Symmetry: D2
Subunit: 115 residues, 4 copies
């Protein structure tokens, strides 16, 4: 599993469940092409977005739909989404975990990159 997304809720102290995630890959013409999508599980995790074969070198954008999440809990939040934009695999295949910690007017994101 070369690309995993983990989302936590800093208000509830819980995984952020049923958070929609859209992944895009920049195409040769500099447009964002849809790559993969899914939603976080009861553990706040999203696995199975892509495969080692399909996850080639490129610039990827991980869009985490935080506004839809907060709205469903009665919070009118600040951000539309949290966007994580990075070059992947440019020194060969790596495994990437994109983690996000959400609050209504703030978020933090990190990456864990393993060989």
């Amino acid at each position: 599993c070369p690309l995993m997304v983990k989302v936590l809720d800093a208000v509830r102290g819980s995984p952020a469940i049923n958070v929609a995630v859209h992944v895009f890959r920049k195409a040769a013409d500099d447009t964002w092409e849809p790559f993969a999508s899914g939603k976080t599980s009861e553990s706040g995790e999203l696995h199975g977005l892509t495969t080692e074969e399909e996850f080639v070198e490129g610039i990827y954008k991980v869009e985490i739909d935080t506004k839809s999440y907060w709205k469903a809990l009665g919070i009118s939040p600040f951000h539309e989404h949290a966007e994580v934009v990075f070059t992947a695999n440019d020194s060969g295949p790596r495994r990437y975990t994109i983690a996000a910690l959400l609050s209504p007017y703030s978020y933090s994101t990190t990456a864990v990159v393993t060989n």
Copy 2:
């Protein structure tokens, strides 16, 4: 000043100086139009991006050029940029401060919205 950007460096414990910032407004055709830009000061701040008159309700994107900042310090970073996307809503008088705290593989962002 309706819109200020503040950038801090979590590796040096300092303001993040000379960081390029680009602000975009979402157009009717759902494309991102350039709106304002500049470079953070010696205090990590960027003021004077826009005016009360021009900063109407809409969806805005603040792109912080973190990759060039880390490259200038000789540190390999993860992200291409940090992106903060939000709706500006006129409910009363308000000032938006977008703050970001940068690390090579992580960032934190918050909004300080005041009257």
Copy 3:
């Protein structure tokens, strides 16, 4: 002002107003001696804790009374307080800003150390 504390609220998108802050210095017997205290202002800031003369090298603890802040907003929080413990080192002239970004189950803290 050698030592300033700044507190932000990640749920409201605001300064964290009227937060009690206690500063301690580590004594020779390895106990924490009260040093300075106060409450954040309407801008989330606490100035005037100490002087250049009194703020000598040593180990300091900044305790931020987050639990009382969340209780006053009717929100169940995780932590008893947020604690920032650091050594003050005289290398050149410097000002320490301790910043904290609060959520009910999370906090972020950074140091901005300037000349």
Copy 4:
């Protein structure tokens, strides 16, 4: 496993490995008593600190020895440690994950609390 600690490195984009963690529990006389200790694994995780039987209601302090960690990588960091202080089990047994994301002059911490 009712108390787990997870530590990430925001500079390297990796688990924070071999981070020492000390847990204390406030005694009736308001002193901190040693409760448990250990170090993070190659995954940045510390399991097996306590048992459901021993982890009774109380105020706990999780001290993460971040200064020792950074010093071993050639970084003179700001903080002495990251301290996470909380009341545990006061509505019955819960499972607690204390997560921390480290930078030289900053850290973020959150808790995931499950029934």
